[model samples]
Target: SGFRKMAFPSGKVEGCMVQVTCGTTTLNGLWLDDVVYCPRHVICTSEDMLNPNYEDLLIRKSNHNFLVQAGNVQLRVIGHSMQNCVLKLKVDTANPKTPKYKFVRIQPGQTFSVLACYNGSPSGVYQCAMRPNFTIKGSFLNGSCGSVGFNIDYDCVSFCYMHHMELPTGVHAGTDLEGNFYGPFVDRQTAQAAGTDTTITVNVLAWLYAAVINGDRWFLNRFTTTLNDFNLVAMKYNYEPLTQDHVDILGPLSAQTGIAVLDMCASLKELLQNGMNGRTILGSALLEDEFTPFDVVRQCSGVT
Candidate 1:
């Protein structure tokens, strides 16, 4: 029997088959042949993968020249990973059509931009080729040689700390003590004369006692009362004998109520610790409660 001939369809008929022979015994010289075939699917052509499509190659040199002169030329290209990209610009108008352009090597997360230049002549066609990667290209009309722009937005890591403190009222206000006001209360002599000092102090002390016994109810009320009074006399009065010491006593209470006393004091201290500047004291209604005098500061620091 004669051996059958087989055909290899690949255009490049190189190393397409292997031959195998069995046994040294001569028995009609039987042999086996294995052949390789091209992929069933057609390979993607360069035209199918080039930027701006293969049809763009048909653009006329005169059109490029006209568009350049009319200032109606634009170009854009998008890169997938920006790796191993080669952007080529060629002036086919001149002889020895070697592309007179720059090659930009893109890093893993970097990008490149190109501007085609033509001086009132046939603008050159720009072609970018990437290895093991792909890109999209575009162009605009009526464009200038030197007029171009590019920008990139990327992901980054950042860190920051909480800048504001929480107060009981749920409001965040500046605490630098730059323009805060304090109020005045009658002194012992004035209180004796007006009969309001004892009443006021008694009221304050009573509220304090309630706060010591009840917690939020009395604490908030007295705090509001003291802060209000302080604001009122902040402009005119100067005698706040109990303000500093009282704040020292009530500081823990404010902290317990979720009030930022340190923040407030640090703010006020910046302004007043330097000098009085004729400012009155901001009193602590929190201290006016009854048991505040005897209540240990440590206990106030622990409450919710």
Candidate 2:
């Protein structure tokens, strides 16, 4: 038998021959010239090469070159068959009609990142055209967010410590003599009357991020100096010891770290009203990544 079952174009490739066999015949003509000449293959796969057929004939062993360039996206190919198989890739361009070829002998139960064509934002897309003749049970294929045809989108964004914030908006709580959270407090009048000592409502979002940034050791020592300077300035502004049950909730380190109760609260209130720029205690300026997004900023879509 000669290379008769090949669906590939043999005449196009010069000196191309098919491996055929006679009775107990072992004849090696040219392997894979059929696939290379046609510039295509059937995307065949076999569990084992014990008995080779038209599918196995088309796949000539090892490495084959495949190139994919479709717009801004890149493509990656992987093996997902239960048994080993060969995959074929064709470029989307017309002028370059000849496809770059790469062959991967995907072994059973093993996953491989066989081919990749990438640029920066290397998130990639993958696709496969399975053979109509063979029935493959299952396999895993990888395609990332960049694949528009796959209907998924991706964004490479910077991450920050904003998620560490305890409450997004604010909360009302009471602090003991040492300026730690005494307990959750409702109305400020009730908390003040109940002898909770310092009843304060705080912008939980601002304070939580402030506390996290401070704990970074770099900011902690820096903020301590800022806190002391702010406290001295605080004395210039006559802050009543008990301001109608409206006090500032200082953090865990407030009193322990030598933050004067009234001063800390006063500074925080200013920070809340004017933001990071209003009070040095909130830092002279927020690092770009340190900025927090509100729920409205994340969810609201209307321009108004």
Candidate 3:
């Protein structure tokens, strides 16, 4: 009933389709302050509402290469932050010589559907914006009138984009909620092409957290010896013992515990195939550094 390591099938790429809408009321918070009045919209300026010279849509960690298709995109703004905003779309085409790049601007409360391109097919990048003289805080739309957000119906095609050529730092190799092989390739080409090497390096912390929390025998038994070494080495480091609450709550110590587990457990380190930059040094003398553990529960679990 939990994650099990298996081969990711070939030919067809696995994707997680996502469709989300904006403009919903803020959830009930205890405080009676600005958060209470915060509407579900983006922040922009009045100048963006006027002409096509606007480009303030925040694009940070929120925007990723996973977006392969956009069925429908709608933009809206809050009433108080400014009054209106704009959404810009840059269409991409295959022929780089002549260049078929076209820009389209959308106003608040208006919607735009990406046109189908025969050569490039999918419109790669969608950039939204605010007007000038205004400072941008966060990337995604959180709730404000001066900002702009959209109802996007897009598919996260793969963890790596089509043009991604760099090697992956680590792969979140595990089973999905429904119990099946869930690992990402470094690039979409190999994922779609013929390959049997499902040996993508897994995030050690994420794998261990998923295994310990789920109590899955497959992962537990697979790393039985490694776990024992971790337990013994944890004691050697004089680390606080993992209690029932620690296992359940997975507090700050969880990160340190996971690192310690890897630092000393050579078998598990090799089995998991972690790809961090300084793996050798990390495993040998990392604990000696002035490093405090972080929130592994949210950080590691989020990847799973």
Candidate 4:
């Protein structure tokens, strides 16, 4: 987890100083709320600047610098507290030929910085509101505004859409579920069988088998199983010789059964690999008590 501490002058301003801390750990998948506040002033309004285009805005300060590990990042100016607030950002600081810049009209409380990218040049000034008639607050003043620098190695945004889509993995479900089921197979089945009576009981049981063998039982014990205890027996014999036809038949049946069996075998393997488990299964009572509910009792009692 990475964090940044920022100090700002206290007073009435349209914007406030914000410290953005992001990294692969805590801040990796976060959306950041950043706003630079500056003193407000009135500028002469013109017909051409009626709407106050964001591109025409000038960067009075230019000491902002940022760091990124690799690849491009996106940002968008959501909205500002001031009336008719617009945000303009650019990559090139030395030259402003066509202003290779991006602009967004920020709505109040709405998410912006969606189009914001932390690529190209690491140093540049970002400006807001092009017209003088529009009052701009929270604008970073030149020199007064500290250099906006970030470590590419520790760069991450909470609300970044790039990391929005959860990654697929053989272990660990992206969502906060009590079972070991994860990846495309779980989602596809869940969606396809959401409201149908196609007997998802077997699929659910198979998923439970995968979960228990995969060590998801540490969390799955929280739920109850309505399916017959057959899945429980199958999970106990995880690596035993079961015909392929048996698997095909039992897999779907377990799903339709809603049997809530904790797949401890899979979890045991994972824990052992992680140096968390010390006991061997061959001598343990895990397979001996397939339907006695003794394991479940011990588990509920926190016997480890």
Candidate 5:
């Protein structure tokens, strides 16, 4: 019922497919806010940033890192302090590079929220803006001299993109909700000859993600472990994960966790070895639930 280790058949790499994701049991702290929001209960702002009237708007986080929809991000605003608070949410895309901005002005004692549009693909880095000249006493959003930062990223950004790579001969590939993929290629020449164009989309805006993550409760909860794993690591490590210190630690930690995952993978692989076996295993692991405490710890880092 839970995760079990599997192995690749000996003597060849054909039909070999491996997928590693961040499972909840895995230890990493980059995503401390993967489930926390910006509120002092309030929180930041900057230019090149959307004007959310940082003082009035709060970046809320989900307490639970369950199955959030793809490209899902969030936004919540309250204009209780300011008489008139205005904010703008910008959405954009990659591959074609499209951007759309949505604005909302709420009065004192009023609240405003929207799922955030502009999501449908990935690769878009969205920015936001808040009231430019709104005067508020001792406001956190006040960067200085009545001009709130409107060009900063608030250090709040997310990435939801699908990766598609070619696989070697006898190997195969599968897709995720995010639709990123990689596969077994007989050879690079073969993949090239076959014209296997590997491409995918990315989600780069918070509001677009707000709608994406909360799109469905069941789906979000279902893949809670893997997606969170992916996201947390991504949130913390960003594109580069292996720092010298990280390697010094991960070297041993990787080996230890790899063995734990291997014990499960070897047995599971034997059973999943067949035409339909791989697909079945894929569904069980990815769709059913991202369970197995030691499942995602397959990093086999060399021990010191």
Candidate 6:
């Protein structure tokens, strides 16, 4: 049972598109092979998270306001996985003789970061290898993006609020929104006008994350935030090395709580844009031992 899976290598990560079929025509979805470079420690949206095998293993981004850094990019590994995997990070330098190596140990059930690999690069071609027995997995730790892979994962789900934005890029339904979502009417009249429904999709972690970050005292007060003091001792392992993985709650004081209408929509809009130190608060919360992804999705979305 000590075998490793081959991980990602720097350079253009190669993966296919999501094939969709209506009757016969297989629509070629966005290409996963291309990505906007996410410089070392710079955590941004992933090209595709659950895109399957190679796609998920390699993290990539596309189209950004950031200027391109034309050079060899330093990639790092971050996140959890099912196997007692080893990360072997190496790049293709001129001489094929000796290769430099870096690594991160990934164990199971700690965080869903596994199943989905989180790492990438740009300059000087690179390669990542993962394995238990067959090959030793590779890893990269970004001091800059402390647990960023996890943060991006958390943020991706919150991107559900994109409909409320107004952008000149023609990339969002924000055209008429005039960037006034949080202040909009409660029933989402604008969205309805746009021919979309009030059916909003969100991740449980993201919701709770927003609930607190947005100062939803009404929600946080219910948590009974007892100093998880001694309770903290249980988390003494370095599952994903560079990660703190601790628990903390933000956004409220006793009796401080409150919602409604378009303002709520606008409020949701604000929460969506407002950033959180996902690495610390949410990341730790998500990686905890007692909680399950199922528990998170059910409670966060109220599907429970």
Writing each residue's lDDT as its tens digit, candidate 6 over 70-154 gives: 1233222222111111111121222222122212222222112211112211112122211111111212222111111111122
Tens-place lDDT digits, model 1, residues 273-304: 24434432223322221223222332333321
lDDT of each prediction vs. the true structure? 0.22, 0.24, 0.24, 0.23, 0.20, 0.22
What CA RMSD would you report for each candidate? 35.1, 26.7, 19.3, 21.0, 24.1, 20.9
List TM-score per model, in order. Answer: 0.18, 0.17, 0.21, 0.16, 0.17, 0.18
Kindly list the per-residue Cα lDDT of model 5 for residues 46-144, writing each as its tens digit: 331223343433333222221122234321221212111111111121112111211122211111111111111211122221111111111111111
**Model 5 RMSD vs true structure:** 24.1
| C-alpha RMSD in Å of predicted model 6 compared with the true structure | 20.9
Which runs in model 5 stand beyond 4 Å of their true positions?
A: 1-155, 158-265, 268-272, 275-304
Model 6 stretches with alpha carbons more than 4 Å out: 1-101, 108-207, 214-218, 222-245, 248-304
Q: lDDT of model 2 at residue 261? A: 39
Go through the candidates in order and give the clash count of each: 24, 7, 10, 50, 55, 44
Candidate 6 TM-score, true structure as reference = 0.18
Instruction: Please give me the total number of clashing residue pairs in predicted model 6.
Output: 44
* Full ranking by TM-score: 3, 6, 1, 2, 5, 4
Report the candidate with higher TM-score, 4 versus 5: 5
For model 6, what is the alpha-carbon lDDT of residue 71? 28
- Superposed by TM-score, candidate 2 places the C-alpha of residue 229 at a distance from the truth, in angstroms, of 26
Residue 193, model 4, lDDT: 19
Runs off by more than 4 Å, candidate 4:
1-86, 91-213, 216-304
